[PDB]
Each structure stands twice: as structure tokens, then as C-alpha cells.
Amino acid sequence: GMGTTEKSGIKEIIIQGLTRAGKPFRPSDWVDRMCSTYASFGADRKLRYSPYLKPRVIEGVRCLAVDLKLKDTNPEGFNQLMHFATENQLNILDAEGNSIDAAQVTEI
Numbered sequence: 808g809m810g811t812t813e814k815s816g817i818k819e820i821i822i823q824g825l826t827r828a829g830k831p832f833r834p835s836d837w838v839d840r841m842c843s844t845y846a847s848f849g850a851d852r853k854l855r856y857s858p859y860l861k862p863r864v865i866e867g868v869r870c871l872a873v874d875l876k877l878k879d880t881n882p883e884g885f886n887q888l889m890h891f892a893t894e895n896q897l898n899i900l901d902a903e904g905n906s907i908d909a910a911q912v913t914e915i
Contacts, residue, residue, distance in 0.1 A: 814911065814914070814915065815901075815911065815915075816915070817875065817901050817902065817907075817911060817912060817915060818874075818875045818876075818902070818915075819872060819873065819874055819875060819901075819902045820872070820873050820875065820899065820900065820901055820902065820907075820912055821863060821865070821870050821871065821872045821873070821899075821900040821901065821902070821904060822841075822870060822871045822873065822888075822889075822891070822892045822897050822898075822899055822900070823865075823868060823870045823897050823898035823899070823900055823906075824837060824838060824868050824869040824870045824871070824897060825868050825870075825897065825898050826895065826896045826897055826898070827896045827897075827898060828896070831868055831869075832895045832896075832897055835869060837869075837871075837895070838862045838869045838870065838871045839862070841860060841871050841888060841891065842856035842857070842860050842861075842862075842871075843856065845857050845859075845860060845877075845884055845888075857877075858874070859873065859874035859876060859877035860872070860873055860874070860877070860888075865904055870900075873885065873888060875912070875915065878913065885913075886913065889909045889912065889913060892909070893909070899912075
């Protein structure tokens with residue numbers, strides 16, 4: 808804010824389920840889809856949502872937390888996950904839940 812916020816040390820982010828217009832995106836299971844989308848069967852024919860991805864609730868809105876470690880191991884995956892925010896125009900937040908841009912993330 809007209810001060811030194813030259814980058815940060817963000818290591819977890821939260822894609823809000825609420826748009827830049829302040830209204831909540833649909834379907835309400837969008838958060839559940841992004842888990843499935845990166846899941847796999849764990850050799851026992853049950854799906855296993857990967858650890859780098861979990862639902863939340865904040866201010867009553869659902870939203871999806873994302874671990875930045877996934878970018879180390881599969882940067883393409885996390886990239887496409889970030890892009891989904893820009894798609895539905897969701898408020899990209901950080902670990903505290905301040906509204907940020909994706910440039911503050913995929914450059915660490």
C-alpha cells in the first residue's frame with residue numbers, strides 16, 4: 808500500500824469461492840471437483856483426494872486451500888489450478904486470507 812510489499816514468503820493460498828463482484832460462484836461442489844481433478848485411486852479402488860488441496864469455510868463461504876508444495880512436484884497442476892480462479896473470477900486470497908494476485912504466487 809504505497810510501501811514495501813516487494814513479494815512475500817507465501818507457501819499456502821486460498822481460492823475463495825466468491826467472485827470479484829462479491830457473489831458466490833457455482834456449483835457449490837466446485838471445491839470438491841478441484842480435489843477430484845488431481846486425485847487417484849490408492850491401489851484399493853477408493854478415490855484419494857491429494858493432501859495439497861483441502862476445502863475450507865471462511866466467512867461462511869466454502870473455498871479451497873492449496874499447498875504451494877504441489878508447484879514443486881507438479882507445477883503444471885498448480886498452474887491450471889490457479890487459472891481456474893481467473894476463469895470463474897474468484898477472489899484469490901493468501902494463507903491469512905488477504906486478496907492477492909497469482910503473480911505473488913507462481914514466482915516464489
